[PDB]
Protein backbone atom coordinates (compact mmCIF):
# COMPACT_ATOMS: atom_id res chain seq x y z
CA UNK A 1 0.00 0.00 0.00
CA UNK A 2 3.16 2.16 0.26
CA UNK A 3 3.83 4.47 3.25
CA UNK A 4 4.59 8.17 3.78
CA UNK A 5 8.19 7.48 4.84
CA UNK A 6 7.58 9.69 7.88
CA UNK A 7 6.30 9.40 11.49
CA UNK A 8 2.61 10.10 10.73
CA UNK A 9 0.37 10.96 7.77
CA UNK A 10 -2.46 8.96 6.17
CA UNK A 11 0.25 6.26 6.04
CA UNK A 12 1.79 6.12 9.54
CA UNK A 13 4.96 4.12 8.86
CA UNK A 14 8.33 3.43 7.19
CA UNK A 15 9.16 3.29 3.44
CA UNK A 16 10.66 -0.22 3.20
CA UNK A 17 11.04 -2.55 0.17
CA UNK A 18 8.17 -5.08 0.46
CA UNK A 19 8.90 -8.80 -0.13
CA UNK A 20 5.40 -10.41 0.05
CA UNK A 21 5.76 -14.25 -0.23
CA UNK A 22 3.23 -16.93 -1.27
CA UNK A 23 0.16 -16.89 1.11
CA UNK A 24 -0.82 -19.79 3.44
CA UNK A 25 -3.28 -22.69 3.10
CA UNK A 26 -5.08 -21.16 6.10
CA UNK A 27 -6.83 -18.55 3.91
CA UNK A 28 -9.19 -20.80 1.95
CA UNK A 29 -11.00 -22.49 4.84
CA UNK A 30 -14.14 -20.95 3.36
CA UNK A 31 -13.52 -22.90 0.15
CA UNK A 32 -16.49 -25.17 -0.66
CA UNK A 33 -15.25 -27.82 -3.19
CA UNK A 34 -17.13 -30.26 -5.47
CA UNK A 35 -17.03 -32.77 -2.60
CA UNK A 36 -19.10 -30.53 -0.30
CA UNK A 37 -21.32 -28.66 -2.81
CA UNK A 38 -22.47 -32.11 -3.95
CA UNK A 39 -23.43 -33.68 -0.60
CA UNK A 40 -24.75 -30.38 0.82
CA UNK A 41 -27.72 -30.20 -1.59
CA UNK A 42 -28.09 -34.01 -1.62
CA UNK A 43 -28.69 -34.27 2.16
CA UNK A 44 -30.80 -31.08 1.99
CA UNK A 45 -33.40 -32.76 -0.22
CA UNK A 46 -33.31 -35.67 2.24
CA UNK A 47 -33.53 -33.59 5.45
CA UNK A 48 -35.23 -30.50 4.00
CA UNK A 49 -36.53 -27.75 6.26
CA UNK A 50 -38.01 -27.49 9.74
CA UNK A 51 -41.14 -25.79 11.24
CA UNK A 52 -39.37 -22.41 11.66
CA UNK A 53 -38.01 -22.58 8.09
CA UNK A 54 -41.49 -23.41 6.73
CA UNK A 55 -43.20 -20.29 8.14
CA UNK A 56 -39.96 -18.42 7.33
CA UNK A 57 -40.51 -18.69 3.55
CA UNK A 58 -44.22 -18.00 4.00
CA UNK A 59 -43.15 -14.86 5.85
CA UNK A 60 -41.22 -13.58 2.82
CA UNK A 61 -43.70 -14.63 0.10
CA UNK A 62 -46.53 -13.28 2.29
CA UNK A 63 -44.94 -10.13 3.76
CA UNK A 64 -41.28 -9.24 3.07
CA UNK A 65 -37.54 -9.64 3.72
CA UNK A 66 -37.35 -6.72 6.19
CA UNK A 67 -39.85 -8.61 8.33
CA UNK A 68 -38.17 -12.02 7.76
CA UNK A 69 -34.76 -10.69 8.90
CA UNK A 70 -36.61 -9.28 11.92
CA UNK A 71 -37.75 -12.81 12.84
CA UNK A 72 -34.61 -14.87 12.15
CA UNK A 73 -32.55 -12.42 14.21
CA UNK A 74 -34.65 -13.36 17.27
CA UNK A 75 -34.81 -16.90 15.86
CA UNK A 76 -31.01 -17.04 15.45
CA UNK A 77 -28.33 -14.44 16.16
CA UNK A 78 -26.70 -11.64 14.15
CA UNK A 79 -27.96 -9.48 11.28
CA UNK A 80 -25.01 -10.94 9.35
CA UNK A 81 -26.41 -14.48 9.82
CA UNK A 82 -29.88 -13.21 8.85
CA UNK A 83 -28.59 -11.83 5.51
CA UNK A 84 -26.97 -15.19 4.67
CA UNK A 85 -30.03 -17.18 5.77
CA UNK A 86 -32.49 -15.30 3.53
CA UNK A 87 -30.17 -15.47 0.49
CA UNK A 88 -30.31 -19.27 0.86
CA UNK A 89 -34.11 -19.67 1.20
CA UNK A 90 -34.76 -17.36 -1.79
CA UNK A 91 -32.76 -19.53 -4.22
CA UNK A 92 -35.09 -22.33 -3.10
CA UNK A 93 -38.28 -20.28 -3.66
CA UNK A 94 -37.31 -19.13 -7.17
CA UNK A 95 -35.49 -22.28 -8.37
CA UNK A 96 -38.12 -24.76 -7.10
CA UNK A 97 -41.53 -23.08 -7.52
CA UNK A 98 -40.70 -21.72 -11.01
CA UNK A 99 -37.83 -23.95 -12.20
Amino acid sequence: TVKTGIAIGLNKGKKVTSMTPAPKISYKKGAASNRTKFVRSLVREIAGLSPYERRLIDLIRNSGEKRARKVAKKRLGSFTRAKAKVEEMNNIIAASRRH
Partner: protein, 203 residues
Protein backbone atom coordinates in the same frame (compact mmCIF):
# COMPACT_ATOMS: atom_id res chain seq x y z
CA UNK B 1 -17.25 -41.59 2.83
CA UNK B 2 -20.35 -42.17 4.99
CA UNK B 3 -18.63 -39.87 7.52
CA UNK B 4 -18.97 -36.72 5.36
CA UNK B 5 -22.69 -37.57 4.95
CA UNK B 6 -23.44 -38.66 8.56
CA UNK B 7 -21.56 -35.57 9.85
CA UNK B 8 -23.61 -32.85 8.07
CA UNK B 9 -26.77 -34.95 8.64
CA UNK B 10 -26.24 -34.60 12.41
CA UNK B 11 -26.13 -30.80 12.01
CA UNK B 12 -29.70 -30.55 10.74
CA UNK B 13 -31.37 -32.17 13.78
CA UNK B 14 -34.20 -29.64 13.23
CA UNK B 15 -35.57 -32.04 10.58
CA UNK B 16 -38.56 -34.37 11.12
CA UNK B 17 -36.43 -37.42 10.21
CA UNK B 18 -33.84 -37.18 13.02
CA UNK B 19 -36.51 -36.28 15.57
CA UNK B 20 -38.34 -39.59 14.92
CA UNK B 21 -35.17 -41.73 15.24
CA UNK B 22 -34.38 -39.76 18.38
CA UNK B 23 -37.79 -40.35 19.96
CA UNK B 24 -37.33 -44.12 19.54
CA UNK B 25 -33.80 -44.39 20.99
CA UNK B 26 -34.38 -41.86 23.80
CA UNK B 27 -37.19 -44.10 25.10
CA UNK B 28 -34.87 -47.07 24.63
CA UNK B 29 -32.15 -45.62 26.90
CA UNK B 30 -34.99 -44.62 29.23
CA UNK B 31 -36.05 -48.27 29.53
CA UNK B 32 -32.50 -49.25 30.50
CA UNK B 33 -30.24 -48.38 33.46
CA UNK B 34 -28.73 -45.07 34.59
CA UNK B 35 -25.31 -46.49 33.69
CA UNK B 36 -24.88 -49.45 31.31
CA UNK B 37 -22.60 -50.69 28.50
CA UNK B 38 -23.51 -49.87 24.89
CA UNK B 39 -22.42 -52.61 22.42
CA UNK B 40 -22.02 -50.42 19.31
CA UNK B 41 -21.48 -46.61 19.00
CA UNK B 42 -24.38 -44.66 17.44
CA UNK B 43 -22.08 -42.03 15.87
CA UNK B 44 -18.87 -43.75 14.53
CA UNK B 45 -18.23 -40.47 12.69
CA UNK B 46 -17.95 -38.38 15.88
CA UNK B 47 -16.52 -41.43 17.63
CA UNK B 48 -13.73 -41.67 15.03
CA UNK B 49 -12.72 -37.98 15.35
CA UNK B 50 -12.26 -38.54 19.09
CA UNK B 51 -10.08 -41.59 18.47
CA UNK B 52 -12.06 -44.74 17.74
CA UNK B 53 -10.71 -48.11 16.54
CA UNK B 54 -13.09 -51.12 16.49
CA UNK B 55 -11.58 -53.96 18.62
CA UNK B 56 -10.51 -55.26 22.09
CA UNK B 57 -10.28 -52.61 24.81
CA UNK B 58 -12.80 -50.13 23.37
CA UNK B 59 -15.66 -49.75 25.86
CA UNK B 60 -18.65 -47.70 24.76
CA UNK B 61 -20.92 -46.45 27.56
CA UNK B 62 -24.35 -44.85 27.93
CA UNK B 63 -25.25 -42.35 30.68
CA UNK B 64 -28.77 -41.25 31.71
CA UNK B 65 -28.14 -37.98 33.61
CA UNK B 66 -30.66 -35.64 35.27
CA UNK B 67 -30.88 -31.92 34.48
CA UNK B 68 -31.85 -28.64 36.15
CA UNK B 69 -29.42 -27.07 38.65
CA UNK B 70 -27.73 -27.76 42.00
CA UNK B 71 -29.99 -27.13 45.00
CA UNK B 72 -27.80 -26.36 48.04
CA UNK B 73 -27.83 -29.36 50.49
CA UNK B 74 -28.82 -27.20 53.48
CA UNK B 75 -31.68 -28.78 55.54
CA UNK B 76 -34.90 -26.68 55.41
CA UNK B 77 -32.81 -24.08 53.57
CA UNK B 78 -30.48 -23.42 56.53
CA UNK B 79 -27.80 -20.94 55.39
CA UNK B 80 -25.89 -18.59 57.80
CA UNK B 81 -24.25 -15.54 56.17
CA UNK B 82 -24.92 -12.64 53.77
CA UNK B 83 -27.85 -12.41 51.29
CA UNK B 84 -25.44 -12.12 48.35
CA UNK B 85 -23.93 -15.36 49.69
CA UNK B 86 -27.41 -16.76 50.47
CA UNK B 87 -28.54 -18.29 47.19
CA UNK B 88 -30.50 -21.55 46.84
CA UNK B 89 -32.10 -22.48 43.50
CA UNK B 90 -30.21 -19.86 41.50
CA UNK B 91 -27.27 -22.19 42.17
CA UNK B 92 -25.49 -23.71 39.17
CA UNK B 93 -22.20 -25.60 38.80
CA UNK B 94 -18.71 -24.85 37.41
CA UNK B 95 -19.01 -28.00 35.34
CA UNK B 96 -21.10 -29.11 32.36
CA UNK B 97 -23.49 -32.09 32.20
CA UNK B 98 -21.16 -33.71 29.66
CA UNK B 99 -18.06 -33.50 31.88
CA UNK B 100 -19.87 -34.67 35.04
CA UNK B 101 -21.34 -37.83 33.45
CA UNK B 102 -17.83 -39.06 32.56
CA UNK B 103 -16.81 -38.71 36.21
CA UNK B 104 -19.59 -41.02 37.47
CA UNK B 105 -18.80 -43.83 34.98
CA UNK B 106 -15.19 -43.60 36.17
CA UNK B 107 -16.15 -44.38 39.76
CA UNK B 108 -17.70 -47.53 38.22
CA UNK B 109 -15.01 -48.75 35.77
CA UNK B 110 -11.78 -47.52 37.42
CA UNK B 111 -9.58 -50.12 35.70
CA UNK B 112 -10.33 -48.18 32.47
CA UNK B 113 -8.90 -44.78 31.51
CA UNK B 114 -11.77 -42.91 29.84
CA UNK B 115 -11.20 -40.81 26.72
CA UNK B 116 -14.12 -38.43 26.02
CA UNK B 117 -17.77 -38.56 24.86
CA UNK B 118 -20.60 -36.72 23.05
CA UNK B 119 -24.28 -35.81 23.18
CA UNK B 120 -26.75 -38.42 21.91
CA UNK B 121 -30.18 -37.60 23.41
CA UNK B 122 -32.18 -35.45 25.88
CA UNK B 123 -35.87 -34.75 26.68
CA UNK B 124 -36.15 -32.57 29.83
CA UNK B 125 -35.79 -34.89 32.86
CA UNK B 126 -32.64 -36.54 31.50
CA UNK B 127 -29.72 -35.87 29.17
CA UNK B 128 -27.87 -38.56 27.24
CA UNK B 129 -24.23 -39.04 26.16
CA UNK B 130 -22.10 -41.72 24.46
CA UNK B 131 -18.80 -42.29 26.31
CA UNK B 132 -15.52 -43.84 25.13
CA UNK B 133 -12.98 -45.53 27.41
CA UNK B 134 -9.73 -47.42 26.78
CA UNK B 135 -8.24 -50.31 28.79
CA UNK B 136 -4.42 -50.16 29.12
CA UNK B 137 -4.43 -53.84 30.22
CA UNK B 138 -4.56 -55.34 26.73
CA UNK B 139 -1.16 -55.88 25.09
CA UNK B 140 -2.83 -54.71 21.85
CA UNK B 141 -3.29 -51.20 23.34
CA UNK B 142 -0.42 -51.45 25.88
CA UNK B 143 2.12 -51.46 23.03
CA UNK B 144 1.42 -49.36 19.88
CA UNK B 145 3.00 -45.89 19.38
CA UNK B 146 -0.48 -44.31 19.49
CA UNK B 147 -1.69 -44.92 23.06
CA UNK B 148 1.54 -45.40 25.10
CA UNK B 149 0.78 -42.26 27.19
CA UNK B 150 -2.39 -43.85 28.65
CA UNK B 151 -0.75 -46.85 30.40
CA UNK B 152 1.41 -44.40 32.40
CA UNK B 153 0.03 -43.12 35.78
CA UNK B 154 0.04 -39.62 34.23
CA UNK B 155 -3.22 -40.49 32.44
CA UNK B 156 -4.99 -42.24 35.34
CA UNK B 157 -8.38 -40.44 35.72
CA UNK B 158 -8.23 -37.53 33.28
CA UNK B 159 -11.93 -36.76 33.82
CA UNK B 160 -11.47 -36.61 37.61
CA UNK B 161 -9.12 -33.65 37.08
CA UNK B 162 -10.37 -32.03 33.85
CA UNK B 163 -7.49 -33.03 31.55
CA UNK B 164 -10.36 -33.73 29.13
CA UNK B 165 -11.75 -31.50 26.33
CA UNK B 166 -14.94 -30.46 28.16
CA UNK B 167 -12.99 -29.91 31.37
CA UNK B 168 -10.31 -27.88 29.57
CA UNK B 169 -13.03 -25.63 28.09
CA UNK B 170 -14.62 -25.24 31.52
CA UNK B 171 -11.18 -25.00 33.22
CA UNK B 172 -10.41 -22.41 30.53
CA UNK B 173 -6.99 -23.62 29.34
CA UNK B 174 -7.25 -21.37 26.27
CA UNK B 175 -5.10 -18.67 24.64
CA UNK B 176 -6.31 -15.08 24.91
CA UNK B 177 -6.58 -11.83 26.90
CA UNK B 178 -10.11 -12.93 27.85
CA UNK B 179 -8.70 -16.10 29.48
CA UNK B 180 -5.85 -14.22 31.19
CA UNK B 181 -6.98 -14.98 34.77
CA UNK B 182 -6.88 -18.71 33.93
CA UNK B 183 -4.30 -19.27 31.18
CA UNK B 184 -2.76 -22.33 32.91
CA UNK B 185 -3.23 -23.02 36.63
CA UNK B 186 -5.69 -20.29 37.71
CA UNK B 187 -4.71 -20.82 41.34
CA UNK B 188 -0.97 -21.19 40.71
CA UNK B 189 -0.97 -17.96 38.69
CA UNK B 190 -3.27 -16.32 41.24
CA UNK B 191 -0.95 -17.29 44.07
CA UNK B 192 1.90 -16.18 41.77
CA UNK B 193 1.01 -12.45 41.82
CA UNK B 194 -0.11 -12.96 45.43
CA UNK B 195 3.51 -13.82 46.24
CA UNK B 196 5.84 -11.41 48.05
CA UNK B 197 9.30 -12.46 46.86
CA UNK B 198 12.55 -10.79 47.94
CA UNK B 199 16.13 -11.57 46.91
CA UNK B 200 19.09 -11.66 49.32
CA UNK B 201 19.20 -7.96 48.39
CA UNK B 202 16.39 -5.40 48.91
CA UNK B 203 16.29 -3.27 45.72
Amino acid sequence: GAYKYLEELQRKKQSDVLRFLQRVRVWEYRQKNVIHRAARPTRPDKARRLGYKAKQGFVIYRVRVRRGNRKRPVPKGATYGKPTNQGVNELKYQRSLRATAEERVGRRAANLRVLNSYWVNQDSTYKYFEVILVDPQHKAIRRDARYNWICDPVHKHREARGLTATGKKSRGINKGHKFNNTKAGRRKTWKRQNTLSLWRYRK
